Every structure is written in C-alpha cells, then in structure tokens.
C-alpha cells in the first residue's frame, strides 16, 4: 500500500484533491 499508492495514488490525489470533496458540490 505505502508503494502502490505512489503513481496511481500521487495522479488520483493531485485531481481530486480539491475535485472530490466538491464533485458533490
């Protein structure tokens, strides 16, 4: 987890990091 959430973890993050509490919003 701490390796898998690297590539696939630092994209998903750096998108929704603001994108994902107001997806809903």
């Given amino acids: 987890t701490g390796n ?3 590539s696939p973890g630092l ?3 750096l ?3 603001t ?3 107001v ?3």
């Fill in 4 to 6: 898998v959430g690297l």
């Fill in 11 to 13: 994209s998903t993050a």
């Fill in 15 to 17: 998108t929704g990091f």
């Fill in 19 to 21: 994108l994902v509490p």
């Fill in 23 to 25: 997806e809903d919003h």
